[PDB]
Design a protein around this ligand. Structure first.
Ligand SMILES: Nc1ccn([C@@H]2O[C@@H](COP(=O)(O)OP(=O)(O)OP(=O)(O)O)[C@@H](O)[C@H]2O)c(=O)n1
Ligand SMILES: Nc1ccn([C@@H]2O[C@@H](COP(=O)(O)OP(=O)(O)OP(=O)(O)O)[C@@H](O)[C@H]2O)c(=O)n1
Ligand SMILES: [Mn+2]
Ligand SMILES: [Mn+2]
Lengths: 129, 129
């Protein structure tokens, strides 16, 4: 009955958008375990960009989120089939903007919706009045 | 067996310090209900200072925190004995830096520890390298 969901990301400076994505993930099915993978500092910087918070900081904040059942920190950048088997993961949840083609082909991808305009750094903009 | 804890604050731009305080509050006793009160925009500005996020935003973020069982939003600025009776509150938890004298006299105050240097706006400083 219980379904293992895996959501990965940077989760830098956690904001409402991240938290809403985690809720979506958690709620994909009636009974779930939500595993969150947090990407490493150097892989993020290498492939995505400067991260503000360290892995240790980004991971500690996620510990406090209601939807998060388990954390894999650091997590591998690219998910692989072996990785899915190691953690008995049933679905991978992430926004969908193809690195996730093979998961969609397998029926293992559950797209989640971004919520724009609610990023921490949008808030700094508001501080600027 | 179950103990009602009440923690109030602004909780603007929620960060690790807030989340650690909420965990402390929640963990004051073995079995607790943690109620969080979020202060109104105009009372905060009037007594404390400019708030970045609205009451509606500050409250929505708290919804996602694992330790939070119930939210009172907005909450009264000053807690009163009548208020404690309305919500069957057993203890009030807040940092202790006296507005809480009457609660200490009653045995109803549980001080919590700030964690400094982990505020969102300290993070903007780090962005400045
Ligand atoms: N405003 C946002 C930001 C993120 N997410 C979700 O969180 C992402 C994973 O986290 P991250 O790797 O942190 O992504 P971004 O925040 O998209 O990236 P940037 O560094 O450019 O802010 C994806 O699952 C996406 O669905 C979201 O739903 N809404
Ligand atoms: N770094 C912090 C910030 C807040 N808190 C806790 O959260 C506070 C309640 O929230 P708020 O009213 O938001 O307080 P400050 O964050 O202290 O205020 P400022 O607006 O000056 O940042 C108190 O309970 C305090 O113990 C904490 O423990 N550590
Ligand atoms: Mn991020
Ligand atoms: Mn605050």
């Amino acid at each position: 009955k219980n379904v293992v969901i895996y959501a990965d990301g940077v989760y830098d400076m956690l904001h409402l958008g991240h938290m809403k994505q985690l809720e979506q993930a958690k709620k994909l099915f009636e009974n779930t375990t939500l595993i969150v993978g947090v990407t490493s500092d150097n892989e993020t910087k290498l492939f995505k960009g400067q991260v503000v918070q360290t892995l240790e900081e980004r991971t500690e904040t996620l510990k406090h989120i209601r939807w998060v059942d388990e954390i894999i920190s650091p997590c591998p950048w690219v998910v692989t089939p072996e990785f899915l088997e190691k953690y008995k993961i049933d679905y991978v949840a992430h926004d969908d903007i193809d690195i996730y083609a093979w998961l969609k082909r397998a029926g293992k991808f559950k797209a989640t919706q971004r919520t724009e305009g609610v990023s921490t750094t949008d808030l700094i903009v508001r501080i600027l009045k």
